């Protein structure tokens, strides 16, 4: 072997007829589809130039071509491109930018993970149609033309966008540009200049003057069809198309476990040299490049089963090529001769890569697609004795032996006389992991995860995937598909999840998402920071809260089982019946422990079963006790005593005061309270900057409420037993401190934003005096939440039985002009047949950091379709 | 110590830059003189006032009115490359300049581009901008069929490979302003692989249209002042400028083995991308530092041994401080290091400044000095904190840290707009492993032959004038013999060619001025150099008094051959050859006239082959001329043909005035019909000289009476009195004696092809026996058919080797009949002096285009930097007036 | 004299100076980018190129009298940070 083998670990393409995926390309090739259509009126009026008489000046003989369903579409915002600059960008560059992202995602890699890598980019561009259209419109004066119409930035932008550091050059080698990029990338990876390579080309047809000019040369087909290797060959038809591949050194790819589609064992390039005419090919030059590539790959030509020829369909090009192949390949052993350009026309720049992609697919499925538009070879090739043949149907691999890996030969010959050839071998024998036992493939709901750049794109994405799952539901494994959508895709800003146990169930859910009218909204996080647990106070209790979770989640049930004896120890009460009875838990000695048990088990389930690391913890009222447990400051055996011992204490002062809710800032409330000479009523909880909770003497509290109602102020009393965070609790703190004298606080390991300490940023020591202070002092919950946002957290999920502070969090975030998400872990009478997977679905939708490895330990990548795009039409105009 | 790539030697460089710079040496003179090459935009391109606006950011207007412009962009030598005028009109000028400069690069390396046919030479050409495409679509000329190759970028490199018949990889590419040096990266990589043994790298810049300036001006790139104030505190942007530059690259072990001249060694090169950093065009400091240490690692060079950095130096207020701070982090670690940038002198030659920067680096290496930076007055205050050994030279500076233990090394950098950086480390050429310098040898100062060439007459005069100026300057820096060697075996001989004979350079300067000013019409060569000339050997009538006196005194080998043949005639004819050729009166009497003509003519052909290496591709003789032709082609030995001719002249000396030669313009068929009408057999066709000229031999009275018959009928039937009526029945009685008296010779097979007028078919090999000779004095001389078969074989150059040309006019006539352009040179003329021996024939033989053995004429010598020939540029452009 | 916004802003207590600025920025970037921005996600991934940075540079100069430079927006890569950078810069010059 002359060079290092290079593995094609990812492929991406956009091709005429709506083909935008390598798997979709294979289906069309196998079906024998013909993607050559009449020129859409959107490009130009074909009848303004069509003339069947050859060589008529100013007129073309071709009215056909292979066109993309749309070209002006480009998801500009997802790449941070403003419409003003996006409009002037050559569509060839935009399609390359999009398809390169598809190529990386197809490999199972997050493109954002490639930032800072030594990845190299090689893109070939041969047509300046958008430049000419801009010149005709006279819009060259726009400053964005400097970047929009230059050819170097076609690969520069891709490297700039993804933050790559390898070579990022753009070349132009005519119709062999697509395959030349693979040869250059295979060279660069071997030299060590890079560790990953993006190779391919793009061609876009927007102007008739390119077609008529070639028509005057007699190049294009009169019948408008690339009759490759047929007697009626009369020329080619230009066609749009963009295709890219991702290349990585084989030892690295095998070491890192990336899926390998095929191995490029060696490439070679050559020039036709001096010929009769500048565009005439040379037979001996083609024969030389064949032996050069085989020598570089170190493989005998007798073992190359299938040759993917150039096959443009020119009357003189094919006989030269056919003689070239017969002198090297097909030496006795049968050989199959194919050409992708028959099915979709000549893609020019990208024709090299598309031919390669067809070769990759043929290797994987082990068959050769029939060659469209073939009846017989030209009569002048009758005497050539060779093993070559043109398949007229889906044929098995011509060799059929097992001792030798399947190999193909890919060729591409440029107009300027530059030839490219590459030898591709099938992927290595899969390093199959130990077979998954039926116990590992547990029957149970799994999250299938979607993403897109907009609401409509998500609905389109769901529809596409639903049809794909409906086809491969027997061939694909549900475990792998769940793994692939989570661990092997890029989570685009607008995202959702569908939970199901079987693929048919998954399809039905996707169709509901496809036809649903819900306004899916973009995520607010970046997966860099974990969610912030919010532990609310009392009042969220509802009848039979824990019945569903106990019957569904084992860790939740286990947590209650461990904590139940402590309640029966300190308070002598059984929480299992209270949270499962038909009546809401009542009594402070019962209400507080019941809420505490649910919250801590909810947190316990989340970071153990679903492995969600909390980025920060925020506590409100007794929720601070739950907050301490999750933060690692205390053990559950301590806070349970803290809750239980405290809970029985204010049973003495049940009814010792009344609470009021004032929807005004606390600062002005304090000033008005001071100006009124009143000092028994104090601010209890600063819930939001626009709301305040007060408590004190029951009759007096009603008096300011009436004194606020006469001022038409929105105010309300709070129907709860104990005047917490007010001087009414005074007769207990001395007893409470003695009861908590045995508490052993520890330093918190999770960021703790206490609402009791004057500075929320302080990491508390949850000693006895804290809870004494917590009950007496006011709660600056809005301040603590505000502090967490200032630190950068944006996702808050409250773990109470019912949402009570989610509205407060949203108000505080809005008061800071900050985009935040307020999720609810549980809701009153909300059925959750799938357990807490609903919250996990919501947390991912918001964008909190997750340990997807814990949810999806291992699995094989599969071919799930990539997400759609928010294709806004961005084209020049006159 | 570790070198991960093979060192690559730059064996040839060529460029075309603004201000009439057409050669690397002329670039060096400009840099030392501190020339500023940017000018106001010429009205020929566009009206600059139609777009100028000093206010930055104004829509639809450009802030700069200056640029560096080539003196002639539309100029192209279409016919030399075999491209029709129509096709060349629609070819992008970037492609046309690349084709011309690449040819200049190959010649500058000392190689004939025709010798690269079938080689594995690779071609990488950087190329940005599409101004001609913009112009073409504005004029609406895209319907032309030639556009498919004229405007497609891939043909830019494909055309070079197609023209020269190169088989290595050939591609063009775009990497913004770093494409020029990126070509060197790919070429070094391709050579390292073994894919190629020669590589052309470079780029082209062309500035035909204004909107490119307007679009960039809105972005704020364009400099308001109009000069690239590289590394100056007043930097405000760059200025675009035209320019093309190409280099030729070869593996260093191969360059040493073949003995090619090395200008510099590219030890290593590397490239990378800036990555995600602010805006698309904002450069990254850390990326620049990475490529420096990567290139050094690949080249195995520590940075402290690099003394000069050819920085990118665009002149933007953002780019320059990033460059300086990045360089100070790598280079100049305590040791002084000199900064520089070719951008300052000639603006930004986008997509080619990478190569132009490289070329400046090589010239600095060979001359060992750092050119001053033009507009530098003070570094920006932002860089006052940076501590470094770097410094910007304000005058011609000796090489920093100059020493012999460490070879001089240069770092070349070039950064593109897309963010792709290229950086290469260049070392001086290895210590000259030349032959003993000024060693004794061919120290003779005899007049040497200096060769000129071009594509047209007016081009030759321009070429002579340019070379005359160059020789006038370097008359002391180089030896005359080396210049003669360079022009002969180190250049490509274009169709229009001539030579000048001189003994010393001062005479040469006078000679070129005569050629540059003379109104001589220099016709292009008719030969392709494939086949050697065809010697022509004549009959009687060429003799004149004291012919060889000057030749005997000017060609020692001629004299040796004359002396060699002297004894045999002194035995067979009894008289010394020097008598007839040195007497003050013309030799008379066939017994001495005939041997004398044969003796000189044989030595003449001997003089060409032994002394001037002129191997004849074919040989043709006439009458007596077959004897001389037989010796030269190898059909018979030298002395044996001598006894052959003296015996004949003596044997027919028995008769005087045996008959007559009626020479008529009538065709042989027509005179045969006329003779049949006359019915006499006393006269016979003796010589078929031309299709429009026939010679009739026979009895005197039958000739004289009958030739008057055409003279009454107004027919061009002249005759000059001759001693012998050969090829006629008048010599028949002596043939029996002649058939045996000279039968002692032993003919053998010629080693050279022979066309014989004696045989019916000249192409047949003639056995030079007496019977064949007896045919010669009797059979009709079929000379016209003899030369006809020669040109049917494609031979083109015919030289008449006779004291006076007699049959040359016949060659032109038959060539005119054949509609086939041929050369009819004459070896020597009547009374014509020979101040330089037969060198006057050789210069004409070269001008005709025959095959020559230049190795024999020019055994050895070092190549020189003599200026390349000027092109016949024609104004080819697209107009929308 | 200075823009009407600058008179109002200084007359207001300095603690909301970030809040009022954080809007002069959101509105101005919204019209420049033609997209309702958010106050925390970075400009560069909105597509704020070098030109748009100039339009921001000149506009804030008219509205606040502060000479912004393109490196600063490159450093204060988000609106909240940029408004924060404007706040103390206003505070520092005021204290002079
Ligand atoms: C790719 C060809 C790419 C170039 C032509 C299509 C694009 C539009 C024109 C270029 C841009 C113009 C400027 C902007 C508007 C390709 O695959 N081509 C065919 C490859 N075949 C091949 O090389 C051999 C085919 N050649 C011939 O059949 C033969 O040379 C001709 C019939 C074409 C010419 O014959 P003659 O004129 O007698 O030499
Ligand atoms: C050369 C840069 C490219 C010059 C030629 C561009 C001509 C237009 C090409 C497209 C065709 C349009 C016409 C179609 C008919 C170069 O040498 N690049 C390296 C240095 N160049 C830089 O830009 C580096 C310094 N950059 C800057 O100063 C800033 O990024 C600029 C001023 C560009 C933007 O400032 P803003 O980001 O603060």
CB within 8 Å of B229: residues ≥ 6 apart? B223, B235, B236, B315, B344, B375, B376
Pocket of ligand 2 contains residue B135 by CB under 6 Å: no
Rounded Cα distance, B657 and B226, in Å: 90
Nearest of A644, A628, A622, A638 to residue A538 by alpha carbon: A622
Pocket test for ligand 1, best of B143, B152, B156, B170 (most atoms within 8 A of CB): B152
Query: Please, are residues A383 and A74 in contact by the beta-carbon 8 Å criterion?
Result: no
Hey, what CATH class is A658-718 in?
alpha beta
Q: Which helix (H) or strand (E) holds B139?
A: helix B131-139
Q: Which residue has the tokens 């390119």?
A: A210
Q: Which helix (H) or strand (E) holds B694?
A: strand B693-698
The crossing angle, in degrees rounded to 10, of helices A806-815 and A781-790 is 60
Query: What's the gap between Cα B601 and its chain centre?
Result: 32
B714/B704 Cα distance (integer angstroms): 15
Say yes or no: CB of residue A312 within 6 Å of ligand 1: yes
Instruction: Give the C-alpha separation, B836 to B107, whole Å.
Output: 30
Give the closest residue to A849 by CA, choosing from A777, A797, A786: A797
Among candidate residues A7, A488, A485, the one with its CA nearest the CA of residue A246: A7
Task: Please give the Cα distance from B21 to B627 (Å, whole number).
Answer: 57
DSSP B781: B
Phi and psi dihedrals of A864, rounded to 5?
Answer: -60, 135
* Cα separations in angstroms, B130 against B78, B94, B136, B206, C57: 21, 9, 10, 9, 34
Q: Which long-range contacts (CB under 8 A, 24 or more apart) does A636-641 make?
A: A636/A562, A636/A563, A636/A566, A636/A600, A637/A566, A638/A743, A638/A744, A638/A745, A639/A596, A639/A600, A640/A563, A640/A566, A640/A567, A640/A570, A640/A593, A640/A596, A641/A566, A641/A570, A641/A742, A641/A743
Give the sign of the dihedral formed by CA B578, CA B579, CA B585, CA B586: negative
Hey, what are C50's tokens?
Answer: 């070098």
By DSSP bridging, strand A64-65 and strand A6-14 are unpaired
DSSP helix/strand/coil, B853: coil
Q: What are residue B496's phi and psi, to 5 degrees? A: -90, 115
Task: State the Cα angle at B135 between B129 and B137, rounded to 5°.
Answer: 105
- How many CA atoms within 13 Å lie on the side-chain side of B389? 18
**Which H or E run contains B76?**
strand B75-76
Percent of chain B as helix, strand, coil, to the nearest 5? 40, 15, 45
- For the record, the structure tokens of B361 come out as 């680096």
Distinct helix (H) and strand (E) counts, chain C: 5, 0
B370-406 exposure pattern, b = at least 16 Cβ within 10 A, e = fewer: bbbbbbbeebeeebeeeebbbebbeeebebbbeeeee
Residue A737 · residue A776 · CB < 8 Å = no
Q: To which residue do tokens 């603590």 refer?
A: A784
Phi/psi for A148 (5° steps) reads -75, -30
In this complex, the residue of B158, B176, B273 whose CB is nearest that of residue A150 is B176
Ligand 1 contact via A275 beta carbon (within 6 Å): no
Q: Which residues contact B271 (CB under 8 A, 6 or more apart)?
A: A167, A169, A193, B182, B185, B291, B420, B421, B422, B423
Chain B residue nearest residue A145, CA to CA: B215
Q: Which of B721, B737, B678, B686 is nearest to B702 (CA)?
A: B678
The encoded tokens of residue B336 equal 């002084």
Domain B448-517: give its CATH code: 3.30.70.3290
The stretches of A741-878 forming alpha helices (DSSP H) are 768-776, 781-790, 806-815, 837-846, 852-855
Q: Which chain C residue has its CA at the smallest distance from A86's CA?
A: C47
Which 3 state secondary structure label does DSSP give C73?
A: helix
Question: How far apart, in Å, are the Cα atoms of A355 and each of A176, A178, A388?
Answer: 11, 9, 18
Task: Provide the 3-class DSSP secondary structure of residue B698.
Answer: strand
Give the single-character DSSP code of B274. -
Burial grade of B74 (CB within 10 A; 0-12, 13-18, 19 or more): middle
Phi, psi for B33 (deg, rounded to 5): -70, -10
Nearest neighbour of B172 by CB, restricted to A118, A172, A270: A172
Return the beta strands (E) in A339-463 as ranges: 367-368, 388-389, 395-396, 407-413, 418-426, 446-452
Please enumerate in sequence order all residues whose Cβ is within 8 A of that of B748, keeping only pairs 6 or more positions apart, or say none: B634, B635, B636
Q: Compute the distance between CA of residue A279 and CA of residue A271 in angstroms, rounded to an integer.
A: 12
Contact A287, A312 (CB under 8 A): no
CATH 3.40.50.2020 matches A532-653+726-849? no
Residue B336, CB-side half-sphere exposure with 13 Å CA sphere: 11
Q: Give the CA radius of gyration of chain C.
A: 13
The H or E element containing residue B10 is strand B8-16
The residues, any chain, with a CB within 8 Å of residue B779's CB and separated by 6 or more, are: B727, B758
Interface test with B, best of A85, A160, A186, A280 (most B CBs within 10 A): A160
Q: Is residue A277 in contact with ligand 1, taking CB distance under 6 Å?
A: yes
Is any atom of ligand 1 closer than 6 Å to the C-beta of A647?
no
Do B758 and B772 form a contact (C-beta atoms < 8 A)? yes
- CA angle, residues B6, B103, B72, in degrees to nearest 5: 125
Strands A715-718 and A446-452: unpaired
Where helices occur in B576-731 by DSSP H, the ranges are 577-582, 590-606, 612, 625-633, 638-652, 668-678, 700-712
**Ligand 2 atom nearest A135 alpha carbon:** 15
User: Where are the strands (E) in A126-240, listed by range?
Assistant: 170-172, 196-203
Q: Looking at the domain that runs over B534-657+740-832, which CATH code has it been given? A: 3.40.366.10
What CA–CA distance (Å, rounded) separates A867 from A452? 6
Q: What is the DSSP-derived secondary structure letter of residue A427?
A: P
Query: Could A168 and B118 be called an inter-chain contact, meaning their C-beta atoms sit closer than 8 Å?
Result: no
CB C22 within 8 A of CB C83: yes
How far, in Å, CA of A536 to CA of A548, rounded?
A: 21
Closest CA to B101 of B129, B127, B120: B127
Whole-angstrom distance, CA of residue B540 vs CA of residue B645: 13
- Select from A331, A294, A305 the least CA-distant residue to A406: A305
**Which residues of C are less than 8 Å from A817 in CB distance?**
19, 22-23, 26, 39
Residues 6+ apart with CB under 8 A from A569: none
Q: Domain extents for chain A?
A: 6-426, 532-653+726-849, 658-718
Helix axes A503-515, A478-487, angle to 10 degrees: 50
End-to-end CA distance of chain B: 62
B181 sits in which H/E element: helix B179-193
Both tokens of residue B73? 């962009």
Check if B318 has its Cβ closer than 6 Å to any atom of ligand 2: yes
Residue A107 is encoded by which pair of tokens? 């490999």
Work out the end-to-end distance of chain C between its first and last CA atoms, rounded to an integer number of angstroms.
19
Specify the residue for token string 């011609």: B396
Superfamily of domain B659-721: Malonyl-CoA ACP transacylase, ACP-binding (3.30.70.250)
Return the number of other C-beta atoms located less than 10 Å from residue A394's C-beta.
14
Which residues in chain B are closer than 8 Å to A414, comparing Cβ atoms?
Answer: 154, 158
State the DSSP string of B568-593.
HHHHHT-S-HHHHHHSSS---SHHHH
Q: DSSP labels for A617-661?
A: EEE-TTHHHHHHHHHTSS-HHHHHHHHHHHHHHTTTTTTS-EEEE
Domains B8-30+37-428 and B659-721 share a fold: no
Give B221 Cα–ligand 2 centroid separation in angstroms: 6
What whole-number distance in Å separates Cα of residue A294 and Cα of residue B728? 73
- Residue A235 alpha carbon, nearest atom of ligand 1: 28
State the pairing for strand pair B618-621/B754-755.
parallel
What is the crossing angle of helices B732-741 and B770-778, to 10°? Answer: 160
d(CA B631, CA B535): 12
Among the partner-chain residues B219, B278, B280, the one whose CB lies closest to the CB of C74 is B278
- The structure tokens listed for A587 are 């009594």
Round to whole Å and give the CA distance between B728 and B777.
Answer: 8
Q: What topology does CATH give the domain C4-95?
A: 1.10.1200
**Closest to B143 (Cβ–Cβ): which among A115, A128, A212?**
A212
Q: What is the H or E stretch that residue A355 is in?
A: helix A351-365
Q: What is the DSSP letter of A69?
A: S
Instruction: Report residue A56 as tokens.
Output: 């008529």
Q: What is the resolution of this structure in A?
A: 3.2
For chain B, give the residues followed by a break (C–N over 2.5 Å). Answer: none
Backbone angles phi, psi at A572, to 5 degrees: 60, 35
- Superfamily of the domain at B8-30+37-428: Thiolase/Chalcone synthase (3.40.47.10)
| Chain B residues with CB-CB distance to A152 below 8 A | 128, 174-176, 179, 416-418, 420
Provide the shortest C-alpha distance from residue A808 to chain C (in Å).
20
Closest-CA distance, C81 to chain A, in angstroms, reads 11
CA gap B338, A682 in Å, rounded: 76
Determine the Cα–Cα distance for residues B627 and B777; give it in Å rounded to an integer: 12
B125: enclosing H helix or E strand? strand B122-127
Q: Which residue, A48, A5, A807, is CA-closest to A425?
A: A5
Both tokens of B771, joined, read 């019977």
A217 three-state secondary structure: coil
Please report how the helices A503-515 and A455-472 are oriented relative to each other, as an axis angle in degrees rounded to 10: 150
Rounded-to-10 torsion of CA A497, A502, A507, A512 = -60
Hey, what are B297's tokens? 């690692």
Best of B169, B191, B287, B316 to substitute, by most chain A Cβ atoms within 10 angstroms, is B169
- Cross-strand bridge partners of residue B171: B124
Distance of CA A667 to the CA centre of its chain: 46
Can you tell me the distance from the alpha carbon of B159 to that of B150, in angstroms, rounded to the nearest whole number? 10
Packing angle between helix C17-33 and helix C79-95, nearest 10 degrees? 130
Cβ-based neighbours of A243, under 8 Å, separated by 6 or more = A11, A12, A13, A14, A15, A99, A178, A200, A201, A202, A347, A350, A353, A354, A357
DSSP A143: T
Ligand nearest to the CA of A125: 1
Q: B305: exposed, middle or buried (C-beta count within 10 Å: 0-12, 13-18, 19+)?
A: middle
Q: Within 10 A of A403 (CB to CB), how many other CB atoms are there?
A: 5
Backbone angles phi, psi at B411, to 5 degrees: -105, 125
Six-digit token pair at B685?
């066709």
| CB distance B420 to B277 below 8 Å | no
Query: How far is the C-alpha of A704 from the C-alpha of A681, rounded, in Å?
Result: 9
List phi, psi (to 5°) of B415: -120, 130
- The answer to whether A172 and A125 have CB atoms below 8 angstroms apart is yes
User: Which residue in A186, A197, A254, A198 sits closest to A423, CA to CA?
Assistant: A186
Q: CA-CA distance, A698 to A656, in Å (whole number)?
A: 8
Considering only alpha carbons, which residue of chain C is nearest residue A144?
C51
Residues 6+ apart with CB under 8 A from C89: C66
Q: Are A180 and A412 in contact (CB under 8 A)?
A: yes
In CATH, the number for domain A6-426 is 3.40.47.10
**Structural contact between residues B330 and B423, judged by C-beta atoms closer than 8 angstroms:** no
The partner residue sitting opposite C40, judged by closest CB among A76, A77, A819, is: A819
Q: Which chains touch A (3 or more CB pairs under 8 A)?
A: B, C
Which residues, listed in sequence order, are joined to residue B496 by a DSSP beta bridge?
B454
């Amino acid at each position: 072997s002359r060079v290092t083998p290079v593995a094609v670990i990812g492929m991406g393409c956009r091709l005429p007829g709506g083909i935008n995926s390598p798997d979709k390309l294979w289906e069309s090739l196998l079906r024998g589809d013909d993607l050559v259509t009449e020129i859409p009126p959107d490009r130009w009026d074909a009848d303004d130039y069509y003339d069947p008489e050859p060589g008529v000046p100013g007129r073309s003989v071709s009215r056909w071509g292979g066109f993309l369903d749309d070209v002006a579409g480009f998801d500009a915002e997802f790449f941070g491109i403003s419409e003003r600059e996006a409009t002037s960008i050559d569509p060839q560059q935009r399609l390359l930018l999009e398809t390169s992202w598809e190529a990386i995602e197809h490999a199972g890699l997050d493109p954002a993970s490639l930032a800072g890598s030594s990845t190299a980019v090689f893109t070939g561009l041969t047509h300046e149609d958008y430049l000419v259209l801009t010149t005709t419109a006279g819009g060259l004066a726009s400053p964005y033309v400097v970047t929009g119409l230059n050819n170097s930035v076609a690969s520069g932008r891709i490297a700039h966008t993804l933050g790559l550091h390898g070579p990022a050059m753009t070349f132009d080698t005519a119709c062999s540009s697509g395959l030349m990029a693979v040869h250059l990338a295979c060279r660069s990876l071997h030299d060590g200049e890079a560790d990953l390579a993006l190779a391919g080309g793009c061609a876009v047809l927007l102007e008739p003057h390119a077609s008529v000019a070639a028509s005057a040369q007699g190049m294009l087909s009169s019948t408008g069809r690339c009759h490759s290797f047929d007697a009626d060959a009369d020329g080619f038809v230009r066609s749009e198309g963009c295709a890219m591949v991702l290349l990585k050194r084989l030892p690295d790819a095998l070491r890192d476990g990336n899926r390998i589609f095929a191995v490029v064992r060696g490439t070679a390039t050559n020039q036709d040299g001096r010929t009769e005419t500048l565009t005439m090919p040379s037979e001996d030059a083609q024969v030389a490049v064949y032996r050069a590539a085989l020598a570089a790959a170190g493989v005998q030509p007798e073992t190359v089963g299938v040759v993917e020829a150039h096959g443009t369909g020119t009357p003189i090009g094919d006989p030269i090529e056919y003689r070239s192949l017969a002198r090297v390949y097909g030496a006795g052993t049968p050989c199959a001769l194919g050409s992708a350009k028959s099915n979709m026309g000549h893609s020019t720049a990208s024709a090299g890569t598309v031919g390669l992609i067809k070769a990759i697919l043929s290797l994987r499925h082990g068959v050769v697609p029939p060659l469209l538009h073939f009846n017989r070879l030209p009569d002048e090739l009758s005497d050539v004795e060779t093993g070559l043949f043109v398949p007229q149907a889906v044929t098995p691999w011509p060799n059929g032996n097992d001792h030798t890996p399947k190999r193909v030969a890919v060729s591409s010959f440029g107009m300027s006389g530059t030839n490219v050839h590459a030898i591709v071998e099938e992927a290595p024998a899969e390093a199959s992991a130990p077979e998954s036992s039926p116990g590992d493939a547990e029957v149970g709901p799994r999250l299938f995860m979607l993403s897109s750049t907009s609401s409509d794109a998500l609905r389109q994405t769901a529809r596409q995937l639903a049809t794909w799952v409906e086809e491969h539901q027997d061939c694909v494994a549900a475990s792998d598909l769940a793994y692939t959508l989570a661990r092997g895709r890029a989570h685009r800003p607008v995202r959702t999840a569908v939970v199901a146990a079987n693929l048919p169930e998954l399809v039905e859910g996707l169709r509901e998402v496809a036809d649903g009218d819900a306004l899916y909204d973009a995520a607010v996080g970046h997966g860099d920071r974990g969610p912030v647990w919010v532990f609310s106070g009392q009042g969220s209790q509802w009848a039979a809260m824990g019945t569903q979770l106990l019957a569904s989640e084992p860790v939740f049930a286990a947590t209650i089982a461990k904590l139940e004896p402590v309640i029966a120890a300190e308070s002598g009460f059984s929480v299992t019946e209270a949270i499962t009875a038909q009546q809401t838990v009542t009594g402070i000695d019962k209400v507080q422990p019941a809420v505490f048990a649910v919250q801590v088990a909810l947190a316990a389930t989340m970071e153990q079963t679903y492995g969600v690391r909390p980025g920060a913890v925020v506590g409100h009222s007794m929720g601070e006790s739950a907050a301490a447990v999750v933060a690692g400051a205390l053990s559950l055996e301590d806070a349970a005593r803290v809750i239980c011992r405290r809970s029985k204490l204010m049973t003495r002062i049940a009814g010792a005061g009344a609470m009021g809710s004032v929807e005004l800032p606390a600062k002005q409330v304090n000033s008005e309270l001071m100006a009124r000479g009143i000092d028994d009523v104090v601010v209890s909880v600063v819930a939001s900057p626009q709301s305040t909770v007060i408590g004190g003497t029951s009759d007096t509290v009603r008096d300011l409420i009436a004194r606020w109602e006469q001022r038409d102020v929105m105010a309300r009393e709070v129907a709860v037993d104990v005047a917490s965070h007010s001087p009414q609790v005074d007769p207990i703190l001395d007893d409470l401190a003695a009861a908590l004298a045995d508490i052993a606080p520890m330093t918190p390991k999770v960021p703790y934003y206490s609402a009791t300490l004057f500075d929320p940023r302080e990491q508390p020591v949850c000693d006895g005096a804290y809870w004494v202070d917590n009950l007496r002092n006011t709660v600056q919950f809005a301040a603590a939440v505000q502090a967490a946002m200032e630190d950068g957290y944006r996702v808050f999920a409250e773990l109470s039985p019912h949402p009570l502070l989610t509205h407060a969090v949203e108000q505080t975030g809005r008061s800071l002009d900050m985009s935040v998400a307020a999720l609810a872990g549980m809701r009153r009478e909300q059925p959750l047949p799938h357990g807490l997977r609903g919250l996990l679905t919501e947390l991912h939708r918001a964008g909190a950091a997750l340990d997807y490895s814990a949810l999806y330990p291992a699995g094989r990548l599969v071919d799930a379709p990539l997400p759609a795009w928010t294709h806004a039409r961005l084209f020049i105009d006159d």
